[PDB]
Amino acid sequence: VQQITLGNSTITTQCRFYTLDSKTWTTGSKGWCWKLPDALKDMGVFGQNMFFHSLGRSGYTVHVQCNATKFHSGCLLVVVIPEPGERGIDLLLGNLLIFPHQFINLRTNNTATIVIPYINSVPIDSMNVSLMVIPIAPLTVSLPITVTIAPMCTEFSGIRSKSIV
């Protein structure tokens, strides 16, 4: 309903949820770009398995939220594009809608959710896609943006566990 709980994490909207540092969307800001799984290499238990196992395979569930009133104007474009750490990068656009995207128009909504499957040309690889958030219509009244990434359906290699017998 409105309290999705996974492990020791709990999120509100209308294998755990990792909530990244809140970005400040100012009126003269250009956008942001995060690489997966690179944004989670310093994120607790996932970062332990990311550095422990050589090859891996995971899908991701990305929630982008802008806490605001119903008086702010402007629109953000949330897209994940296949092919800097947890901070990500503080940065034609019209053709980026060919990729799985969603617009956050503050007049109507304040959240956007994108489910990414494993997209690669090999079945497993050593730990592919980048989440980008672009302000298309400028912010007219700053607003904090909170990003929550939950890795789901994560699989790993038999190395570190096969016996030589």
Binding site: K70, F71, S73, L92, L93, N95, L97, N105, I119, I136
Partner: protein, 199 residues
Amino acid sequence: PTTTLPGSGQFLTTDDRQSPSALPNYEPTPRIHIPGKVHNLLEIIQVDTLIPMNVNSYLIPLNANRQNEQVFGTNLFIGDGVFKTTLLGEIVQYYTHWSGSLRFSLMYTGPALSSAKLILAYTPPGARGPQDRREAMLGTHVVWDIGLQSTIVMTIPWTSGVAGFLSCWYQTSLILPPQVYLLSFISACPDFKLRLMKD
């Protein structure tokens, strides 16, 4: 016992022929299930993409104290002007004949307290574009109230223009709370054909 006919030993670039393999008995790397396999280009021009009608180049600006005036106006030539860089016009520039219906959409990005009434007039090819709000409502149009529905879709009929006009007018002025922008999108209906591939 045979006799060779004319056009033997010919080099046709468009002649699809089966051939001897240079690496016989070689087993290639097997095919795995990668998502989003595209079998036809008619699957990707169907996606709505922004039109650079003016980052500010994709935003159509609206301003207060304007009634019976025009917001924007465009021709529907999908090979030049505002459609030249969109994903639809980038793939249409690969063929000579399109022959299908289009999907034009609009999206308002202003505050929730703002409200305005816009008339979106479509003039078909061969006729003259409207020059007043009265001529625009007397033609084909939709009265779009920004206050209730923040996003509208209008399907342009099948044309095969190888184009007509499409304009927007302020019925009432934009009432702002104490500039805002429109975002327009373009794609093709599922009836859209494409023929004679060129370079």
